[PDB]
């Protein structure tokens, strides 16, 4: 059905949308942004330690 309609199911881009001075559900949204940044820095720290070397061997 998705290929015949050619339409894709929408993903949640709410984490990009979040804004300051908002309600309790959006307080959950900004803390979600903090956990995503700590994970993103951890994921970037592994790539830096590996170096290109890992892109070289593949």
């Amino acid at each position: 059905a998705l290929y015949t309609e050619y339409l894709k199911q929408r993903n949640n881009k709410k984490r990009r949308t979040p804004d300051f001075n908002d309600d309790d559900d959006t307080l959950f949204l900004e803390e979600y942004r903090r956990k995503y940044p700590r994970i993103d820095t951890s994921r970037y720290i592994p790539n830096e330690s590996s170096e290109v070397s890992l892109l070289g061997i593949v």
Partner: protein
């Protein structure tokens, strides 16, 4: 009697003994493991234990050194604190169960205050704005240092991936003609 390099070793051992008495008797919490100075909070908490809270607030401002430091005539303590710890230990199965039951009540109180939150909302987004400043500038530095090195070898990777999709398409028409 002829001492040679012994009074220097004895003065070093006496200085090593005096540093061991000053480091141990400085503070119990500061020496073991891990605050902002606030005289307004000590004035606001006066209205609590209402005598011991002001004794512990002045002890916290003295050990940390809008902040004035006054009395380091408090902590020669090392013999008086040993008698005070041994006298209090004598005054202190049943006691182990009463501490475990009170720890479960405090753990249920810690789980209830966290559940109600999830003023205070403006501080969490500002800590995130500090994180989005720190981590994303660290991300953009780690990306662009990578992208100067990886996007060269991504083109080495992706254009060699494109050689596979033509080697596969030439393989099928040759196997069909074979």
């Amino acid at each position: 009697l002829t001492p040679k390099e012994l009074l220097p070793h004895d003065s070093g051992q006496e200085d090593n003994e005096r540093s061991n008495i000053k480091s141990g008797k400085q503070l119990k919490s500061r020496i073991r493991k891990f605050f902002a100075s606030l005289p307004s909070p000590k004035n606001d908490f006066e209205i609590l234990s209402e005598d011991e809270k002001e004794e512990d607030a002045e002890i916290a401002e003295y050990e940390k050194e809008e902040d004035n430091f006054i009395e380091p005539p408090s902590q020669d303590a090392p013999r008086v604190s040993l008698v005070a710890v041994p006298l209090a230990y004598s005054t202190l199965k049943n006691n182990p169960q009463s501490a475990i039951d009170n720890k479960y009540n405090l753990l249920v109180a810690n789980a209830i205050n966290k559940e109600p939150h999830m003023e205070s909302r403006m501080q969490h987004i500002t800590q995130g704005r500090t994180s989005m400043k720190i981590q994303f500038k660290t991300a953009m530095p780690p990306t662009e240092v990578l992208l100067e090195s990886i996007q060269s070898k991504v083109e080495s990777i992706e254009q060699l991936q494109r050689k596979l999709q033509h080697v596969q398409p030439l393989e099928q028409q040759n196997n069909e003609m074979c």
